[PDB]
Amino acid sequence: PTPKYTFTERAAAGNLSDAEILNSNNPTGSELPDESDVVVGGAGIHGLIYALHASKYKPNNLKISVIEKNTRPGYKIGESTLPIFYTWCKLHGISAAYLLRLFGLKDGLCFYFLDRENQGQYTDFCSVGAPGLVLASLQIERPMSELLFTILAQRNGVNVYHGREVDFKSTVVQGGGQGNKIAVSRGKYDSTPKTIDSALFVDATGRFRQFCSKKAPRHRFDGWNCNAFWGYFTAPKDESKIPFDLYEGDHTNHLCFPEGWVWVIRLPSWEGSPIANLMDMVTYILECADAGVPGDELPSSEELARMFGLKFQWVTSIGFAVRNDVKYPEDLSAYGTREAEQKFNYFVQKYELLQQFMSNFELIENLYGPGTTWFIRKTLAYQSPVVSGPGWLAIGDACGFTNPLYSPGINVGMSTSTWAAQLSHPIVEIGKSAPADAAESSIRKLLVPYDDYCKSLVPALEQMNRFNYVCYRDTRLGPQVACLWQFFAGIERYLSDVNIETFAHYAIKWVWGAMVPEYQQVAQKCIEHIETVPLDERLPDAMVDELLAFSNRIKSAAVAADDFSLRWDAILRSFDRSLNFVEGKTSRDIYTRQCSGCGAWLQLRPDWKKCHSCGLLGTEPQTAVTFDPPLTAEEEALLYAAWNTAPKYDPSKELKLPTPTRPA
Ligand SMILES: Cc1cc2nc3c(=O)[nH]c(=O)nc-3n(C[C@H](O)[C@H](O)[C@H](O)COP(=O)(O)OP(=O)(O)OC[C@H]3O[C@@H](n4cnc5c(N)ncnc54)[C@H](O)[C@@H]3O)c2cc1C
Numbered sequence: 041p042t043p044k045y046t047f048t049e050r051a052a053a054g055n056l057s058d059a060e061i062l063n064s065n066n067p068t069g070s071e072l073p074d075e076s077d078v079v080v081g082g083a084g085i086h087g088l089i090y091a092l093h094a095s096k097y098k099p100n101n102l103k104i105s106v107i108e109k110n111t112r113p114g115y116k117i118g119e120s121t122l123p124i125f126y127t128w129c130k131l132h133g134i135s136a137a138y139l140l141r142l143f144g145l146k147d148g149l150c151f152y153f154l155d156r157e158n159q160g161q162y163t164d165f166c167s168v169g170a171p172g173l174v175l176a177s178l179q180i181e182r183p184m185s186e187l188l189f190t191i192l193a194q195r196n197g198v199n200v201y202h203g204r205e206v207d208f209k210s211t212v213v214q215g216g217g218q219g220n221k222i223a224v225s226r227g228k229y230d231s232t233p234k235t236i237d238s239a240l241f242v243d244a245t246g247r248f249r250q251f252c253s254k255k256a257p258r259h260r261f262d263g264w265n266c267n268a269f270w271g272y273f274t275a276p277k278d279e280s281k282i283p284f285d286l287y288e289g290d291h292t293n294h295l296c297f298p299e300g301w302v303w304v305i306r307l308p309s310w311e312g313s314p315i316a317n318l319m320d321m322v323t324y325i326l327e328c329a330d331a332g333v334p335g336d337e338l339p340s341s342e343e344l345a346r347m348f349g350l351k352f353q354w355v356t357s358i359g360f361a362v363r364n365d366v367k368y369p370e371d372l373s374a375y376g377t378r379e380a381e382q383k384f385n386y387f388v389q390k391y392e393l394l395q396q397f398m399s400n401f402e403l404i405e406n407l408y409g410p411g412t413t414w415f416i417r418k419t420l421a422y423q424s425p426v427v428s429g430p431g432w433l434a435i436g437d438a439c440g441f442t443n444p445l446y447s448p449g450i451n452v453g454m455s456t457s458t459w460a461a462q463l464s465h466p467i468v469e470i471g472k473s474a475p476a477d478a479a480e481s482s483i484r485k486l487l488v489p490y491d492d493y494c495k496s497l498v499p500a501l502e503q504m505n506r507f508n509y510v511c512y513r514d515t516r517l518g519p520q521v522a523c524l525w526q527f528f529a530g531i532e533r534y535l536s537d538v539n540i541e542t543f544a545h546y547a548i549k550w551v552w553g554a555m556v557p558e559y560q561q562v563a564q565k566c567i568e569h570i571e572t573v574p575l576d577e578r579l580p581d582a583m584v585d586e587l588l589a590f591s592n593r594i595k596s597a598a599v600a601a602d603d604f605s606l607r608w609d610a611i612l613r614s615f616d617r618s619l620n621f622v623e624g625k626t627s628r629d630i631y632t633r634q635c636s637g638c639g640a641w642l643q644l645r646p647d648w649k650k651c652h653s654c655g656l657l658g659t660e661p662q663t664a665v666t667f668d669p670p671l672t673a674e675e676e677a678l679l680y681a682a683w684n685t686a687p688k689y690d691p692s693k694e695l696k697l698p699t700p701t702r703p704a
């Protein structure tokens with residue numbers, strides 16, 4: 041396909057604002073409709089996942105309008121995504137060759153555990169992702185992901201309106217099929233708001249809980265909560281001076297210690313690009329995905345920036361997520377002038393490994409506009425007690441949130457977004473087909489499992505977060521108990537069988553494995569012991585011995601009961617096939633390489649000879665996926681064949697769950 045510059049030229053011809061050029065791509069028009077079936081407040085990632093999944097699950101059934109306050113897709117923290125997210129993108133028609141032009145490659149998770157009392161000592165836990173012919177994970181700049189899903193939504197019959205705000209003071213939400221009146225303005229100052237008459241309102245306003253807060257007070261869990269502070273840094277081409285052995289920038293890297301952990305995420309940034317030019321680039325990429333353009337014939341990221349007049353750079357997202365019972369010095373003025381900067385730099389100099397690590401990175405000033413060099417957010421975890429009611433439901437962060445760790449926010453949270461999307465079709469039809477009293481009663485009963493799932497979801501994720509945090513207080517418990525159990529309980533068994541029809545049903549059974557009984561049994565034993573040791577103290581060595589022995593005893597039985605075949609010793613660098621810890625083991629599959637020209641991390645497969653980010657050609661390591669232990673040519677062909685195309689929906693087939701097999 042020849043690239044078109046439709047939006048760039050339309051914007052210049054009409055001198056259109058950012059919101060006006062975006063809204064001009066709507067199928068129904070740039071102005072709000074008088075009526076809709078569903079109105080979604082908020083076009084964050086979940087509001088858009090919801091609208092995309094609802095239209096894809098059953099096309100041409102629901103008229104859906106998404107209302108977003110930002111004039112263009114705004115900055116969000118939350119950049120790391122997991123295989124279930126990519127699978128969802130692939131099911132919606134965008135595979136890795138196209139996504140990697142916009143987003144950074146993610147190949148597994150790596151954890152480094154720093155000893156607080158023995159500075160310089162550390163251990164690690166490293167895993168790999170998948171071959172390029174299997175799947176990819178992504179590090180996403182959120183202004184780009186929300187733009188991608190906006191354009192994709194607009195191309196699938198969904199209207200998205202930026203620069204428009206739901207007025208929750210005058211909005212009326214009623215049950216049955218009686219009808220909502222959603223008031224939409226451009227802000228407080230706008231005294232000519234519009235009304236959308238509609239059947240279902242979806243609260244996707246994130247942590248702001250703009251609608252469901254009216255129905256219940258925000259709920260907090262017992263015990264300590266977490267604070268976060270972060271910033272953006274350069275992304276070094278040469279990672280060889282990082283003070284951790286075998287470090288690789290294309291993981292989501294975690295620097296873990298008693299007080300909390302640091303995330304390190306390498307990703308490309310498009311900041312500075314005009315919004316109209318970005319729409320043209322994204323539209324071109326989708327036209328290429330529609331036509332099936334092969335990766336080596338698709339322009340590279342930097343070539344796209346030249347074609348469409350964009351700005352492109354590599355950055356590292358680095359942030360702390362620490363417990364809010366940490367004692368800080370009263371005066372931190374020596375480390376900066378703002379609290380976020382002060383606490384970031386104070387914590388770095390508390391660990392020599394963190395300071396040696398950070399000395400590979402240069403701070404970026406105001407990457408996302410003035411005042412964005414430093415970010416801080418306090419008291420992260422919460423839950424919404426009420427997530428549905430007459431005429432409305434909530435999804436995503438509006439239901440609750442725990443912690444960045446293991447990225448449940450996007451990847452687990454999309455279970456609610458996609459289930460609500462599926463449920464939205466019968467919800468709307470019930471109201472159009474039955475009198476008001478019975479309609480409301482039938483909708484209420486239909487949503488009882490959705491309410492019950494949300495109610496138990498956040499507490500389970502909260503226990504999962506505390507489980508990892510307490511084990512991060514020791515360099516043996518971290519990798520050998522917490523990491524091991526999250527990977528065994530949470531690896532996505534039978535993901536290659538998921539399709540659009542089963543996606544929500546599968547996703548709600550995942551929960552990162554946090555509902556697995558043996559997982560909860562080990563987590564409760566560790567939490568119960570470690571929470572009795574004050575944070576400023578080292579864990580007694582006998583406590584670590586006992587928790588380790590208890591964990592390994594429960595592990596051996598649960599691993600023997602799992603009937604899912606997996607080359608565990610190839611995926612986890614430090615463990616054998618039976619998930620036994622091996623002290624000196626370093627062997628692992630090799631799925632990626634770093635481009636010598638631009639530093640971008642690449643997936644190895646024989647049909648991607650050039651760097652997808654800068655276009656530089658490689659010389660035969662792409663065919664050099666290293667399987668260790670090796671696979672025959674037939675086993676390798678069989679692996680790739682399983683992941684080629686998702687199977688058609690077979691209503692006779694029973695859904696296979698991602699969690700380990702029950703012991704029976
Ligand atoms: C420090 C930190 C790190 C994190 N890291 C990760 C990670 O690595 N991976 C991960 O998966 N998750 C991560 N998360 C969680 C993740 O950021 C959230 O789960 C995710 O952004 C939730 O998306 P959402 O669409 O529900 O809400 P948001 O993305 O917050 O979107 C809400 C939208 O609603 C709009 N809005 C608000 N009020 C109105 C109104 N009245 N009218 C119209 N629109 C309105 C806002 O403009 C906004 O765009 C992290 C969270 C934190 C705090």
Ligand SMILES: CC1(C)c2[nH]c3cc(Cl)ccc3c2C[C@@]23CN4CCC[C@]4(C[C@@H]12)C(=O)N3
Nearest residue numbers: 123167168169170171174526527531532611
């Ligand atoms: C199941 C997947 C998505 C997975 N999910 C993880 C979660 C954590 Cl926490 C760590 C590692 C993984 C992996 C690595 C896997 C293991 N599978 C072997 C056959 C195909 C596949 C898919 C992929 C593969 O090639 N790599």
Ligand SMILES: CC1(C)c2[nH]c3cc(Cl)ccc3c2C[C@@]23CN4CCC[C@]4(C[C@@H]12)C(=O)N3
Nearest residue numbers: 459462489544545546548691692693694695
């Ligand atoms: C398990 C059930 C109760 C179920 N549980 C869900 C949870 C969510 Cl979140 C979404 C959908 C479902 C469904 C619909 C199912 C899926 N199964 C396919 C084989 C038999 C069965 C049973 C039934 C079926 O025919 N329909």
Ligand SMILES: [Cl-]
Nearest residue numbers: 120292446447
């Ligand atoms: Cl992650």
Ligand SMILES: [Zn+2]
Nearest residue numbers: 635638651654
């Ligand atoms: Zn390159």
